[PDB]
């Protein structure tokens, strides 16, 4: 069998009304989630968000939903996002590279959505069940 599951990556950003003491101009939020009706927790062990080295403790882990990071900053950047699976064999994880871009002052808030598709060939019985409970479909 071959099982396909959908992931949704996305982010929001907007100008703060008041810059922080550090000079951070924006609030933003990044997320990994399933499409409507899909609880990806069935097959996702954790999501690791790799922030820019300019952030303290840049490696941010969510072991359970919502898989997200809420932060404040002054600039956008490329954010590796690793999704780890509740799997006993390969693939154990997948790494997306996510563009966390901010809006320029005067322009509308960012509200970006990105749909990803994962294909698993011949998963174990145990892992197949997890994928199907998360809204996976055989292909």
């Amino acid at each position: 069998c071959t099982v396909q599951v959908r992931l949704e990556l996305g982010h929001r950003a907007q100008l703060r009304k008041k810059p922080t003491t550090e000079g951070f101009t924006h609030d933003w939020m990044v997320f990994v989630r399933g499409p409507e009706q899909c609880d990806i927790q069935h097959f996702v062990e954790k999501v690791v968000f790799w922030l820019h080295d300019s952030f303290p403790k840049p490696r941010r882990v969510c072991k359970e939903p919502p898989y997200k990071v809420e932060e404040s900053g002054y600039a956008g950047f490329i954010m590796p996002i690793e999704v780890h699976f509740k799997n006993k064999e390969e693939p154990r994880k997948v790494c997306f590279t996510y563009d966390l871009f901010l809006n320029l002052e005067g322009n509308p808030p960012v509200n970006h959505l990105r749909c990803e598709k994962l294909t698993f060939n011949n998963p174990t019985t145990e892992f197949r069940y997890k994928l199907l409970r998360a809204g996976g479909v055989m292909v």
């Binding site: 300019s54 600039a75 901010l102």
Partner: peptide, 7 residues
């Protein structure tokens, strides 16, 4: 929109 410099 400002972005964090790579170099």
């Amino acid at each position: 929109a400002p972005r964090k410099q790579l170099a």
